[PDB]
């Protein structure tokens, strides 16, 4: 899968992107890879944060379904108009599929300033896509048309410091591997969760530790109301109990440092003297997994170098500055950027199960490393699922 490895650009904050083309002739544009949603949907009409965008008129193969869509989340929205056209990866599988295309005519606080994507590639299942479960999703179409085996996986690659405008264009951001599993992008075992249902990418978490220390809530507290693998959502989002007992241990664990409380909001950067971010005094959070086998599950081990966002000083100074990504959740837990920052993560559709290993591009120090590991003999599991 050489020709698929380095296919992505981008950051945690902005999103990481991939190339693709719509139409006839082949109209170039940068897509936001997003296993959270299940549209596929560029912006097609002019925008100040877009250098280009999809024009049907230009397409010989555009077609128009005669159907409004309508796209609202919490922090943001998006309208436009259905149809479908002619889709290729460049750097992917080397085949045109026939797809819908939401064409973006209208939005709020959707498009990021100077993320450099103009579209987005909803990677998750039908019944989440709107207006309904009857618009295919790209990778449902992909799979349909080709002999792109029904799976994907993703290495999101953190710099594990701030990168310029420049940089980030020049940087390679990671890979996106359709049909099959690189195993350059990983080391040790892949340990694989299952999909509880195919809506979101929905896991179910059993056990939570900060330092080795059991967080001891009821562990449907930790799936409520649901715990989703969102690669186009940037921080790790916990529920509000589960939040708040995490923020008590790690301001704990933290303690011989002091931080203004807007830091653990997550809307203050803190900066330290270059080269001198004390990694050490921040507790490793472990998130237990429920696992394929009955009564087993395994631990994914997340660094601060994961939970800490590198961000560039207001004062653009010689300190090493970062923010919180660690935010209070009403839509339940959400592994967003920063947390597969530090995994290679395999997202095998036809399996119906979610794979985890340690990143090849993970950040971390000298004495300590990310973690997949197992198995741990744990009961009840199912019942740790919201319902
Ligand atoms: C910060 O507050 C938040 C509150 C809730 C969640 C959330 N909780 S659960 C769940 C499924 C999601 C979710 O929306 N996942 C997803 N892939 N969404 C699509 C998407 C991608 C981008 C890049 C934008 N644009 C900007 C500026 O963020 C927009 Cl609008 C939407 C995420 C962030």
């Not at 899968?1 to 139409?23: A, C, H, I, P």
């Not at 750097?91 to 939005?107: K, L």
């Not at 002999?147 to 290495?155: E, G």
């Not at 939570?208 to 930790?222: A, S, T």
Request: proline share 5%; charged share 20%.
């Amino acid at each position: 899968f050489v020709e698929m490895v380095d296919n992505l650009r981008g950051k945690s904050g902005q999103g990481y992107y991939v190339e693709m083309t719509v139409g006839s002739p082949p109209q170039t544009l940068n897509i936001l890879v997003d296993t959270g949603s299940s549209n596929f949907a560029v912006g097609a009409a002019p925008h100040p944060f877009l250098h280009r965008y999809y024009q049907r008129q230009l397409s010989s193969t555009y077609r128009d379904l005669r159907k409004g869509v309508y796209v609202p989340y919490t922090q943001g929205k998006w309208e436009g108009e259905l149809g479908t056209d002619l889709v290729s990866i460049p750097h992917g599988p080397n085949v045109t599929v026939r797809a819908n295309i939401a064409a973006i005519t209208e939005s709020d606080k959707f498009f990021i300033n100077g993320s450099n994507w103009e579209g987005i590639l909803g990677l998750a299942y039908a019944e989440i896509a709107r207006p309904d479960d009857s618009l295919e999703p790209f990778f449902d179409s992909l799979v349909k048309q080709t002999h792109v085996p029904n799976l994907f996986s993703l290495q999101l690659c953190g710099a594990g410091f701030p990168l310029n405008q420049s940089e980030v264009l020049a940087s390679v951001g990671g890979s996106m591997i359709i049909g099959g599993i690189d195993h350059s992008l990983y080391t040790g075992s892949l340990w694989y969760t299952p999909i509880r249902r195919e809506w979101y990418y929905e896991v179910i978490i059993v056990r939570v530790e900060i330092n080795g220390q059991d967080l001891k809530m009821d562990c449907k507290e930790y799936n409520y109301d649901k715990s989703i693998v969102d690669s186009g959502t940037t921080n790790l989002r916990l529920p509000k109990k589960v939040f708040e007992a995490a923020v008590k241990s790690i301001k704990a664990a933290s303690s011989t440092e002091k931080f203004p409380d807007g830091f653990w909001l997550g809307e203050q950067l803190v900066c330290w003297q270059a080269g001198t971010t004390p990694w050490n005094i921040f507790p490793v959070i472990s998130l237990y997994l429920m696992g394929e086998v009955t009564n087993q599950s395994f631990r994914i081990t997340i660094l601060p170098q994961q939970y800490l966002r590198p961000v560039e000083d207001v004062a653009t100074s010689q300190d090493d500055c970062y923010k919180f990504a660690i935010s209070q959740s009403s839509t339940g837990t959400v592994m967003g950027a920063v947390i597969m920052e530090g995994f290679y993560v395999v997202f095998d559709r036809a399996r119906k199960r979610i794979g985890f290993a340690v990143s090849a591009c993970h950040v971390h120090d000298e004495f300590r490393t990310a973690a997949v590991e197992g198995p741990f003999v744990t009961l009840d599991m199912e019942d740790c699922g919201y319902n």
